[PDB]
Amino acid sequence: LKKIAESFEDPSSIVVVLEFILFALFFPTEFNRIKGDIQNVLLLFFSRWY
């Protein structure tokens, strides 16, 4: 995955989550290829919001 330096400080950061969901719809394959690297970002999102 290309690096995404998100802090998820603000609700607007949901943008990045959408960016992933969309990527997982249009391109399930590459998504599955890089989803661990995506998960590193999602954990930053989840540890803040939940």
Partner: protein
């Protein structure tokens, strides 16, 4: 460690200050806008701190 304990402590500290400044904000009937702005600056300090 994925998480930094020195930073997480500052996180709980800031949550406490959020509750405190929240109570003082509602007691002085100040605008919702400024109040959320205080909270925003606090979470920003949280990020800088990590």
């Amino acid at each position: 460690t994925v998480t930094n304990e020195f930073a997480s402590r500052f996180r709980t500290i800031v949550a406490t200050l959020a509750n405190v400044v929240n109570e003082r904000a509602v007691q002085d009937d100040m605008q919702k806008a400024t109040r959320s702005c205080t909270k925003q600056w606090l979470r920003h300090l949280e990020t800088q701190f990590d």
